[PDB]
DNA sequence: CTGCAGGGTTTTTGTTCCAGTCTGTAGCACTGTGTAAGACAGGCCAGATC
């Protein structure tokens, strides 16, 4: 980092993973690593979520079911709650 | 000092191919929603005329 890139370790270390992983890999790798510091989501805009709802034919209780489930596990809730829809 | 020509430079950006590994799509034969009445013709028995 010192010889060629002055010494900014954060930028160096984050980049390191990609080639070792992506040498023989996933897709998952592109994703987990792509989430990082920039981003994000944050929240899927309520309109997009709404689209997913009425276009995949999700019942309000079924949808809310999904919301609760995705939110409790690893959440980081993605979907927007009912009242905002 | 300037102007641009045409070279130096590193550093993008991509290049050809062979093992594969993942991922999204087309190929499959094939499905869902059209859903109830009347009109016209002919026969013929009933039933009223008279």
Curated annotation (Swiss-Prot):
Belongs to the RAG1 family. In the adult, predominantly expressed in the thymus with lower levels in the pronephros, mesonephros and ovary. It comes from Danio rerio (Zebrafish). It comes from the Eukaryota. This is V(D)J recombination-activating protein 1. The RING-type zinc finger mediates the E3 ubiquitin-protein ligase activity. It is found in: Nucleus. Homodimer. Component of the RAG complex composed of core components rag1 and rag2. The gene is rag1. Catalytic component of the RAG complex, a multiprotein complex that mediates the DNA cleavage phase during V(D)J recombination. V(D)J recombination assembles a diverse repertoire of immunoglobulin and T-cell receptor genes in developing B and T lymphocytes through rearrangement of different V (variable), in some cases D (diversity), and J (joining) gene segments. In the RAG complex, RAG1 mediates the DNA-binding to the conserved recombination signal sequences (RSS) and catalyzes the DNA cleavage activities by introducing a double-strand break between the RSS and the adjacent coding segment.
